[PDB]
């Protein structure tokens, strides 16, 4: 649960996603393993949904600072493009959203500046594309 020596409040939290394919269960994005090789077991995978999404539930309202999203790296890296990262409160009202067009490297870092939220959803905006995430780390600052 510590990453770059900061408390990752997403680690081991309940997760869900739009569907599962290739046994890529949503808990693989909070297993503390940033390995983005799908065949190594640490990467999520949905079916080609309308659209595909993944979410972590922090179980209670918390204050969200940095969210770091680690892509799949072995193949199909471009799938993680044209997507929203959305924070929802305890009643599933949208409290903040950032749009990411694509990644220049293996991850993206977003700063939600202490926004109060319970859920963090990663939602592809291109339908018919599987969502795969190696890891999603969430910090309080
Ligand atoms: C470990 C194993 O044998 N599982 C199979 C996967 O390796 C297959 O993935 C495709 O495999 C080729 C080599 O033959 C290459 O690694 C491709 O990148 C890979 O395909 C991608 O990954 C899949 C998980 C899907 O996301 C697919 O849409 C990608 O294009 C898969 C698919 O044939 O079958 C497993 O059984
Ligand atoms: Ca992982």
């Amino acid at each position: 649960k510590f990453n770059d020596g900061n408390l990752n409040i997403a680690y081991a939290k309940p997760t869900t996603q739009s569907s599962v394919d290739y046994n890529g269960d949503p808990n693989r994005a909070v297993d503390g393993n940033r390995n983005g090789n799908f065949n190594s077991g640490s990467v999520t995978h949905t079916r080609a949904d309308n659209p595909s999404w993944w979410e972590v539930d922090l179980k209670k309202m918390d204050k969200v600072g940095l969210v770091k999203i680690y892509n799949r790296t072995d193949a199909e890296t471009q799938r993680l493009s044209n997507f929203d990262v959305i924070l929802y409160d305890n009643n599933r009202n949208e409290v903040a959203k950032k749009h990411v067009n694509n990644l220049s490297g293996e991850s993206v870092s977003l700063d939600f500046k202490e926004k109060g939220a319970r859920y963090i959803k990663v939602k592809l905006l291109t339908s018919g594309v599987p969502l795969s995430l190696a890891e999603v780390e969430v910090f309080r600052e």
Side-chain angles (χ1 to χ4, degrees):
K1 108 180 139 148
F2 307 106
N3 272 294
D4 302 296
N6 303 132
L7 176 62
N8 167 17
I9 65 173
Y11 171 76
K13 290 288 188 305
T15 58
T16 59
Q17 64 186 29
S18 55
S19 64
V20 186
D21 209 358
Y22 301 103
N23 302 320
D25 290 323
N27 74 159
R28 295 175 182 196
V30 298
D31 67 358
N33 186 4
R34 297 173 176 176
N35 192 155
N37 185 338
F38 185 75
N39 285 331
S40 93
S42 138
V43 184
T44 70
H45 206 290
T46 66
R47 304 175 188 199
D49 295 323
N50 300 83
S52 302
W53 60 262
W54 172 97
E55 186 180 78
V56 60
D57 175 2
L58 300 178
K59 296 193 82 172
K60 66 192 186 23
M61 288 287 283
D62 218 315
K63 307 281 214 188
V64 179
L66 168 72
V67 172
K68 196 151 182 169
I69 298 167
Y70 294 85
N71 203 357
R72 186 174 180 182
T73 57
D74 62 296
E76 304 297 356
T77 59
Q78 83 289 335
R79 291 177 171 163
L80 189 65
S81 63
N82 187 32
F83 70 96
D84 287 345
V85 182
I86 314 166
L87 273 55
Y88 298 94
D89 73 6
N90 208 57
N91 295 124
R92 282 185 181 282
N93 303 303
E94 179 180 317
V95 295
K97 176 164 108 192
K98 287 174 177 304
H99 183 122
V100 180
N101 298 41
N102 46 221
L103 274 64
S104 41
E106 291 181 3
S107 65
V108 59
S109 294
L110 301 172
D111 184 359
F112 284 94
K113 310 292 198 73
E114 302 190 11
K115 191 74 78 201
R118 175 170 168 177
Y119 310 94
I120 297 177
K121 182 174 191 159
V122 176
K123 180 180 63 184
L124 296 189
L125 302 183
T126 308
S127 77
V129 180
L131 179 58
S132 288
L133 296 169
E135 196 75 3
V136 177
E137 296 179 352
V138 175
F139 306 90
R140 291 199 259 252
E141 53 153 26

PDB file of all heavy atoms in Angstrom, residues 27-35 41-44 133-136, ligand 2:
ATOM      1  N   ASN A  27      -9.711  -6.361  -9.821  1.00  0.00           N
ATOM      2  CA  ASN A  27      -8.775  -6.268  -8.692  1.00  0.00           C
ATOM      3  C   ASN A  27      -7.317  -6.278  -9.099  1.00  0.00           C
ATOM      4  O   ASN A  27      -6.455  -5.861  -8.329  1.00  0.00           O
ATOM      5  CB  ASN A  27      -9.103  -7.306  -7.604  1.00  0.00           C
ATOM      6  CG  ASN A  27      -8.728  -8.752  -7.943  1.00  0.00           C
ATOM      7  OD1 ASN A  27      -8.578  -9.576  -7.023  1.00  0.00           O
ATOM      8  ND2 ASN A  27      -8.634  -9.082  -9.157  1.00  0.00           N
ATOM      9  N   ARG A  28      -7.028  -6.639 -10.360  1.00  0.00           N
ATOM     10  CA  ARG A  28      -5.637  -6.643 -10.782  1.00  0.00           C
ATOM     11  C   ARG A  28      -5.061  -5.226 -10.878  1.00  0.00           C
ATOM     12  O   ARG A  28      -3.828  -5.047 -10.852  1.00  0.00           O
ATOM     13  CB  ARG A  28      -5.467  -7.411 -12.087  1.00  0.00           C
ATOM     14  CG  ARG A  28      -5.778  -8.850 -11.973  1.00  0.00           C
ATOM     15  CD  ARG A  28      -5.746  -9.654 -13.251  1.00  0.00           C
ATOM     16  NE  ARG A  28      -6.133 -11.063 -12.959  1.00  0.00           N
ATOM     17  CZ  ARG A  28      -5.928 -12.084 -13.759  1.00  0.00           C
ATOM     18  NH1 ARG A  28      -5.297 -11.893 -14.878  1.00  0.00           N
ATOM     19  NH2 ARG A  28      -6.363 -13.318 -13.418  1.00  0.00           N
ATOM     20  N   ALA A  29      -5.907  -4.189 -10.918  1.00  0.00           N
ATOM     21  CA  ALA A  29      -5.420  -2.815 -10.977  1.00  0.00           C
ATOM     22  C   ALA A  29      -5.173  -2.218  -9.592  1.00  0.00           C
ATOM     23  O   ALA A  29      -4.708  -1.092  -9.475  1.00  0.00           O
ATOM     24  CB  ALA A  29      -6.375  -1.922 -11.789  1.00  0.00           C
ATOM     25  N   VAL A  30      -5.451  -2.988  -8.535  1.00  0.00           N
ATOM     26  CA  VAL A  30      -5.169  -2.533  -7.160  1.00  0.00           C
ATOM     27  C   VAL A  30      -4.374  -3.572  -6.345  1.00  0.00           C
ATOM     28  O   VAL A  30      -4.485  -3.623  -5.119  1.00  0.00           O
ATOM     29  CB  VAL A  30      -6.474  -2.061  -6.410  1.00  0.00           C
ATOM     30  CG1 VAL A  30      -7.070  -0.882  -7.125  1.00  0.00           C
ATOM     31  CG2 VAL A  30      -7.484  -3.184  -6.224  1.00  0.00           C
ATOM     32  N   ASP A  31      -3.615  -4.387  -7.056  1.00  0.00           N
ATOM     33  CA  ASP A  31      -2.900  -5.493  -6.424  1.00  0.00           C
ATOM     34  C   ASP A  31      -1.473  -5.116  -6.031  1.00  0.00           C
ATOM     35  O   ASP A  31      -0.747  -5.967  -5.495  1.00  0.00           O
ATOM     36  CB  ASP A  31      -2.944  -6.770  -7.290  1.00  0.00           C
ATOM     37  CG  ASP A  31      -2.188  -6.672  -8.583  1.00  0.00           C
ATOM     38  OD1 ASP A  31      -1.627  -5.609  -8.904  1.00  0.00           O
ATOM     39  OD2 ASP A  31      -2.121  -7.696  -9.319  1.00  0.00           O
ATOM     40  N   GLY A  32      -1.103  -3.854  -6.182  1.00  0.00           N
ATOM     41  CA  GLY A  32       0.220  -3.363  -5.798  1.00  0.00           C
ATOM     42  C   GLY A  32       1.315  -3.676  -6.790  1.00  0.00           C
ATOM     43  O   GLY A  32       2.486  -3.387  -6.512  1.00  0.00           O
ATOM     44  N   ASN A  33       0.945  -4.203  -7.947  1.00  0.00           N
ATOM     45  CA  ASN A  33       1.864  -4.664  -8.986  1.00  0.00           C
ATOM     46  C   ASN A  33       1.697  -3.818 -10.236  1.00  0.00           C
ATOM     47  O   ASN A  33       0.651  -3.912 -10.891  1.00  0.00           O
ATOM     48  CB  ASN A  33       1.677  -6.155  -9.266  1.00  0.00           C
ATOM     49  CG  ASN A  33       2.705  -6.697 -10.240  1.00  0.00           C
ATOM     50  OD1 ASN A  33       3.601  -5.983 -10.662  1.00  0.00           O
ATOM     51  ND2 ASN A  33       2.607  -7.973 -10.530  1.00  0.00           N
ATOM     52  N   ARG A  34       2.700  -3.012 -10.582  1.00  0.00           N
ATOM     53  CA  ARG A  34       2.603  -2.132 -11.757  1.00  0.00           C
ATOM     54  C   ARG A  34       2.942  -2.813 -13.095  1.00  0.00           C
ATOM     55  O   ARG A  34       2.855  -2.191 -14.147  1.00  0.00           O
ATOM     56  CB  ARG A  34       3.510  -0.938 -11.593  1.00  0.00           C
ATOM     57  CG  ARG A  34       3.189  -0.020 -10.428  1.00  0.00           C
ATOM     58  CD  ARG A  34       4.262   1.062 -10.250  1.00  0.00           C
ATOM     59  NE  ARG A  34       3.927   2.011  -9.199  1.00  0.00           N
ATOM     60  CZ  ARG A  34       4.740   2.987  -8.807  1.00  0.00           C
ATOM     61  NH1 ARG A  34       5.919   3.168  -9.409  1.00  0.00           N
ATOM     62  NH2 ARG A  34       4.360   3.812  -7.837  1.00  0.00           N
ATOM     63  N   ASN A  35       3.354  -4.076 -13.051  1.00  0.00           N
ATOM     64  CA  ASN A  35       3.729  -4.836 -14.257  1.00  0.00           C
ATOM     65  C   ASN A  35       2.608  -4.749 -15.278  1.00  0.00           C
ATOM     66  O   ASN A  35       1.490  -5.174 -14.999  1.00  0.00           O
ATOM     67  CB  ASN A  35       4.023  -6.300 -13.873  1.00  0.00           C
ATOM     68  CG  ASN A  35       4.695  -7.111 -14.982  1.00  0.00           C
ATOM     69  OD1 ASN A  35       5.398  -8.119 -14.693  1.00  0.00           O
ATOM     70  ND2 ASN A  35       4.527  -6.710 -16.184  1.00  0.00           N
ATOM     71  N   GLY A  41      -0.294 -11.421 -15.327  1.00  0.00           N
ATOM     72  CA  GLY A  41      -1.363 -11.544 -14.364  1.00  0.00           C
ATOM     73  C   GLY A  41      -1.782 -10.299 -13.618  1.00  0.00           C
ATOM     74  O   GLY A  41      -2.701 -10.374 -12.803  1.00  0.00           O
ATOM     75  N   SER A  42      -1.104  -9.180 -13.841  1.00  0.00           N
ATOM     76  CA  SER A  42      -1.369  -7.962 -13.061  1.00  0.00           C
ATOM     77  C   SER A  42      -2.165  -6.868 -13.759  1.00  0.00           C
ATOM     78  O   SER A  42      -2.224  -5.776 -13.221  1.00  0.00           O
ATOM     79  CB  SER A  42       0.001  -7.420 -12.603  1.00  0.00           C
ATOM     80  OG  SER A  42       0.259  -5.982 -12.669  1.00  0.00           O
ATOM     81  N   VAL A  43      -2.789  -7.198 -14.884  1.00  0.00           N
ATOM     82  CA  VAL A  43      -3.451  -6.238 -15.768  1.00  0.00           C
ATOM     83  C   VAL A  43      -4.910  -6.649 -15.952  1.00  0.00           C
ATOM     84  O   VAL A  43      -5.235  -7.813 -16.227  1.00  0.00           O
ATOM     85  CB  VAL A  43      -2.734  -6.170 -17.141  1.00  0.00           C
ATOM     86  CG1 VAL A  43      -3.330  -5.087 -18.096  1.00  0.00           C
ATOM     87  CG2 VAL A  43      -1.248  -5.907 -16.983  1.00  0.00           C
ATOM     88  N   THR A  44      -5.801  -5.660 -15.830  1.00  0.00           N
ATOM     89  CA  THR A  44      -7.241  -5.892 -16.033  1.00  0.00           C
ATOM     90  C   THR A  44      -7.573  -6.039 -17.507  1.00  0.00           C
ATOM     91  O   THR A  44      -6.760  -5.704 -18.379  1.00  0.00           O
ATOM     92  CB  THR A  44      -8.076  -4.752 -15.445  1.00  0.00           C
ATOM     93  OG1 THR A  44      -7.877  -3.593 -16.243  1.00  0.00           O
ATOM     94  CG2 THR A  44      -7.665  -4.410 -13.988  1.00  0.00           C
ATOM     95  N   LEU A 133      -5.915  -2.014 -17.554  1.00  0.00           N
ATOM     96  CA  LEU A 133      -5.157  -1.140 -16.682  1.00  0.00           C
ATOM     97  C   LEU A 133      -4.190  -2.037 -15.891  1.00  0.00           C
ATOM     98  O   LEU A 133      -4.608  -3.053 -15.293  1.00  0.00           O
ATOM     99  CB  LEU A 133      -6.094  -0.422 -15.708  1.00  0.00           C
ATOM    100  CG  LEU A 133      -7.108   0.525 -16.339  1.00  0.00           C
ATOM    101  CD1 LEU A 133      -8.175   0.990 -15.373  1.00  0.00           C
ATOM    102  CD2 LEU A 133      -6.382   1.682 -17.058  1.00  0.00           C
ATOM    103  N   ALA A 134      -2.902  -1.679 -15.894  1.00  0.00           N
ATOM    104  CA  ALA A 134      -1.924  -2.415 -15.084  1.00  0.00           C
ATOM    105  C   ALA A 134      -2.090  -2.088 -13.598  1.00  0.00           C
ATOM    106  O   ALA A 134      -1.934  -2.965 -12.747  1.00  0.00           O
ATOM    107  CB  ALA A 134      -0.508  -2.078 -15.523  1.00  0.00           C
ATOM    108  N   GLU A 135      -2.362  -0.816 -13.280  1.00  0.00           N
ATOM    109  CA  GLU A 135      -2.515  -0.405 -11.909  1.00  0.00           C
ATOM    110  C   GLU A 135      -3.098   1.002 -11.875  1.00  0.00           C
ATOM    111  O   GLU A 135      -2.793   1.807 -12.746  1.00  0.00           O
ATOM    112  CB  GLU A 135      -1.166  -0.418 -11.175  1.00  0.00           C
ATOM    113  CG  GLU A 135      -1.266  -0.371  -9.658  1.00  0.00           C
ATOM    114  CD  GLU A 135      -1.709  -1.661  -8.975  1.00  0.00           C
ATOM    115  OE1 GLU A 135      -1.914  -2.697  -9.648  1.00  0.00           O
ATOM    116  OE2 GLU A 135      -1.908  -1.621  -7.735  1.00  0.00           O
ATOM    117  N   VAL A 136      -3.913   1.280 -10.870  1.00  0.00           N
ATOM    118  CA  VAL A 136      -4.398   2.623 -10.564  1.00  0.00           C
ATOM    119  C   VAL A 136      -4.091   2.905  -9.106  1.00  0.00           C
ATOM    120  O   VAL A 136      -4.558   2.206  -8.242  1.00  0.00           O
ATOM    121  CB  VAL A 136      -5.924   2.762 -10.834  1.00  0.00           C
ATOM    122  CG1 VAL A 136      -6.410   4.143 -10.445  1.00  0.00           C
ATOM    123  CG2 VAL A 136      -6.271   2.499 -12.275  1.00  0.00           C
TER     124      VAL A 136
HETATM  125 CA1  LIG B   2      -1.579  -4.575 -11.131  1.00  0.00          CA
END
